Every structure is written in C-alpha cells, then in structure tokens.
Write an enzyme that holds these catalytic residues in place. Structure first.
Site, PDB file in Angstrom:
ATOM      1  CG  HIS A 104       2.034   3.484  -2.587  1.00 35.58           C
ATOM      2  ND1 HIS A 104       2.261   4.384  -3.603  1.00 35.58           N
ATOM      3  CD2 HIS A 104       1.615   2.340  -3.183  1.00 35.58           C
ATOM      4  CE1 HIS A 104       1.991   3.816  -4.767  1.00 35.58           C
ATOM      5  NE2 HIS A 104       1.598   2.574  -4.541  1.00 35.58           N
TER       6      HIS A 104
ATOM      7  N   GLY B 137      -1.725  -2.169  -9.804  1.00 33.35           N
ATOM      8  CA  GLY B 137      -0.509  -2.945  -9.971  1.00 33.35           C
ATOM      9  C   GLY B 137       0.556  -2.275 -10.831  1.00 33.35           C
TER      10      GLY B 137
ATOM     11  CB  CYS C 174       2.361   1.943  -8.111  1.00 32.58           C
ATOM     12  SG  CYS C 174       0.916   2.974  -8.156  1.00 32.58           S
TER      13      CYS C 174
END
Lengths: 5, 306, 306, 5
Positions: free
Chosen positions: C41, C143, C145
C-alpha cells in the site's frame, strides 16, 4: 536473605 | 492506537555486553571504549558472599585474574579498580560498537529498559520502573548479574542500572553505573528486605491521560478535588502523596486532553473508592503505575481521539 | 525469580529497517541481502486506499518511482515485484548487517516480538501474541506500517509479521513475510472487523505452570477433571477447547512441577468458576494468556522452587 | 473501518 545474582 | 509496556530497541546495548570471569564465577559486564564495568562480587566465591571484604579480596587479584570474553574474542585486562560496588577493568581494546552514552542515576518512579543477559549473551528485553522502595520487579536467574538498564534519547544511551541481587520477595536490586546502590542494599548475602512499597501516583495519572488520548473517558466525573483532599484518599490506599510538582509535570498531558489535573485526580479518587466495576482502562483491570508522563507522550498520538 | 512479558533483543532486526517512499507516502521496509520488503500500500495515495487495484497502480510505477533510505544512505532500486500484499524491491546493495534468517508463518496463540518503527527508525520493542481471531493487540501510530514481528532462535531471526493496518476496535492486522494476511483481512480501507476472540487456554495453563515453578501453589486443588468436563467449562467462559495435543505439549512443564496436566486443568476450572478472591498469580489479578509453553521454559528456571 | 497504517 539477599541473594547475589 | 493501543498501549503496551514498550522497551527501547536494544541493539546499541547488545553490542556492549561481554562475559567476565574470575575463578569459577562468571557474570556479565558492560564494555564501553576501553573499560569493562561489572559487579564487584564477581571476585567472590560462594563462601565470600556472606561477609566479603572487597578491599581485601581484590588486592589479592592481578589483571590476569580476570578473563573478559566479547563474543568469541578474548580481551586482555591491563588495569583494574573498584568504584563503589563495581569493578572497572581496563582492557587493551576499545569497543568499536560503543554508542554515544551517559551514566545517569534515575529517580524512583522513573522507568527504563532492561537487557537481561547470561554469559555475556543478551536473552531478552523488557521495561520496568524503579519502585519507590528502590527495587525493580524484574525477571532474573542465576548468571544475570551485570545485566543493564537504560533509556535511549536520540542515539545516546543513558545507562542507569546494573543488576546485582535478588531479595526474598522475588524483587531485584542493583546499582547505577558508578556502582552506588539504589536503596539501602549492600552486596553481600545477609538478611535484607525491600522496604514497604507505594503506588506511583504520578504514573497512574499519566496513564489515565493516555487512556483519554486514546479515546476513552468512562472513568471521568463531574467532580474536582483539592490537592489536600486527594492526599487523604492517597494515604488510605497507599498511593504516593500528589505534589504541586506532579501537577506541573502533568501540564502538557492535561493541555492535550482538556482535563484539568485536579479533575483527573477527582476521577482517580473515585476509581480508588469505587473500583472499576468490571471495566478496563487501556485493556487493564487495575490501575497501572509503570508508565511515566514521558512514556505516555513518547507512545501516544499527539492528537487526542476526541 | 520474577516473570515479565519479555521481547527478544532487537539489534539483529534494527539493522534491517529502512524507509521506503513512493510519492508522498512513506513507511518502513525490511532490508535483507539485496531486497527490501514493504507493504504494497506504499504505492497508494489516500484516494487509492478505499478501492485500490494494486496490479493497475503498480504497472504505472518504475524502479525510480521508489526511494529507499537506509540511515542517511540512499539505496537504488533496480527491480520490483509484488508478492501477495508486499512489494519486493531489489536494490543495488546487499545489507551488510543481514542476520541469518527465515520467514515463518506463525500460528494463532503463538507469540513474537514487535519492533515498532517510524520513517525507518526503530522506536520500541514489545512482545505480543497472535490472537485466535488473527489480530494482535499492538501499539502503532500512523507511519508504523512495515514494522516487523519476529522470534530469535540462537542467532537466526525468524520473521513472522509485517504490520499493515488497524481495525476499529484498536487492534492490528498484517501479513507474514510472503505478504499473505493472517486472518480474513484485506489491504484496503473498507468496513472490516476483527472476529470474536477467545482466550488461549494452552497459554493460561503454561503460565499457571510458570507460577508453580516460581514457588506459588495457592490456586491448586485436590481435584482432577476429564478433558470433556473441562471443555464444558471452557465454552462457558470463552476459552479455547483443550485438546489432547495441548495436553501433550504441556508434558515437560508438567514433569518439572509434578502436576498432572488435567489436575492443573482442574485448578483452572476452579479459578474460572470461583475467581481469584483478591489474590494474584505471578503478580497478575487476571489469568494471563500471552505466554506460550515455550515462553515459560525460555524464561523460568529449569529448577522448580519446591 | 480498516485503517491502513
């Protein structure tokens, strides 16, 4: 009884 | 979202752990630059432990009385001295992995990360608080002495604890990195006992602020309280008296949530007198006291879930 | 003595964290040898997040669409591909800090250490369990991920989790290092919800064994139970059914304490029906389920405090 | 409401 590690 | 007892990444510290051996006693030491720090009781045999005279035991040792192993590399000791309850072994090599660091003596209620080690090999890391009675509730087995506690600010490691012993209640005691014990404990196997402990009020409040920042307000109420009336309840429940300094420290958290410190104290007073009625706060069924105001700001969002 | 949720030392993993940027979206990636793994993503802008077609979004990117920063060093991407929900960015340099490693898909009830990271910079480490409903109760902010979960055996890092998202209840979901999600979740911002969770019976038993190894037997009783009668109580209290395989796994702990598994199950049945009556076990007022039988053997003494 | 981190 303190045991030293 | 979420809230966990989080430790600092331990890498900068793993690179400083070594094994120190003197005779048949082996434990962990901390290698910074050209020095290795370790508990002075490494020079004791089991019979020296009840009434050791360290000055006397040490004068009988030479530099080669000490074996220092970093990984599978032997370091050579070229000097040694005692600083309070630690030994400082000067070695012929400077640790190339030495991080920027400082030695700090933390205050009761403050928290730090512990890197549990055995035979100079790190095995686990966890967070804990220096209790008001100067012990920590760690998890240590034989061979863990010399394991250290620390905090990391930017890329500076602030060392604040070295493990030395376990007390009868299963709690732990040790020293700062200058070898001075936290608390009235001494490094000998005599009858010693942790003093009566207390709940760290400031931390419980900080944690209630974290719960609100994370979107939960169920425990709040319409009341407020004076510092004095709060302290009467604190004494009854064995909580540290709240001080004006504590109220000042909670300023930022209070501002981020819009909840006045004394109104949060009123919420706490109610939780203390009424219990939690089957409910939880940040996943806990009890009032948590091992997160400082700093730990909350570090971990929680800077934006409240309104 | 003592018992703490202990994470593995994180150094071997800190050295593999990098930052990956695509457009204005930045997150964490894992750099092993000449590849960087990260959530796919990262190629989404906020508008792509509700109904992204990753195949379509990706074909529109080139190698230079990706910026990879390791420390203050820019890495150059020379290839890219998608593997389920991750991107594998081939870079022109091999991470010299790559540890021996493996990618493993852990099973529900198992535990692992999480290295929370932001902008490729590790910030904290904590232990957690893969819940039966396939989520973890982590602590993550925007932030995070690309942050990873792992276990360490000797000096081999077994990576098992990469963080991708947060669900409405504040819990977290992600994938193994092949990009396959744990649970029925998908990487898009649609209505998704964690399924009903259950208590990990095997772990609660293991933890009761740890309490005995550490010298506490207050909760034991003179009774025993059949697997079947235990499971009737488990269903009532939302605990996973106990199986013969669970009983077999508890063999070593049972042998070290001299307490037959089903007698410990009888103790648990009683704790479940009667509560703890104001008492604690290993410092807890609740039945803990985030320690596996392996976590207990790892942390506790191999000698019971009889 | 899944939020991508």
């Amino acid at each position: 009884x303190a045991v030293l590690x | 979202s979420g809230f966990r007892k989080m430790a600092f990444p331990s890498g900068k510290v793993e690179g400083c752990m070594v094994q120190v051996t003197c005779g048949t006693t082996t434990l962990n030491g901390l290698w910074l630059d050209d020095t290795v720090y370790c508990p002075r009781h490494v020079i004791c045999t089991a019979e020296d432990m009840l009434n050791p005279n360290y000055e006397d035991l040490l004068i009988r040792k030479s530099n080669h009385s000490f074996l220092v192993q970093a990984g599978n590399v032997q370091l050579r000791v070229i000097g040694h001295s005692m600083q309070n309850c630690l030994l400082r072994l000067k070695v012929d090599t400077s640790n190339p992995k030495t991080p920027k660091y400082k030695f700090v003596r933390i205050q009761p209620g403050q928290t730090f990360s512990v890197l549990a080690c055995y035979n100079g090999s790190p095995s686990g890391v966890y967070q804990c608080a220096m209790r008001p009675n100067h012990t920590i509730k760690g998890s240590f087995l034989n061979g863990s002495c010399g394991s250290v506690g620390f905090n990391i600010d930017y890329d500076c490691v602030s060392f604040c604890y070295m493990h030395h012993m376990e007390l009868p209640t299963g709690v732990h005691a040790g020293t700062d990195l200058e070898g001075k014990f936290y608390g009235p404990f001494v490094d000998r196997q005599t009858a010693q006992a942790a003093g009566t402990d207390t709940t760290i009020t400031l931390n419980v409040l900080a944690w209630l602020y974290a719960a609100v920042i994370n979107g939960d307000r169920w425990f709040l109420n319409r009341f407020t309280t004076t510092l004095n009336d709060f302290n009467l309840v604190a004494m009854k429940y064995n909580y540290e008296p709240l001080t004006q300094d504590h109220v000042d420290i909670l300023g930022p958290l209070s501002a981020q949530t819009g909840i006045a410190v004394l109104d949060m104290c009123a919420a706490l007073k109610e939780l203390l007198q009424n219990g939690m009625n089957g409910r939880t706060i940040l996943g806990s069924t009890i009032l948590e006291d091992e997160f400082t105001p700093f730990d909350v700001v570090r971990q929680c969002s800077g934006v409240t879930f309104q």
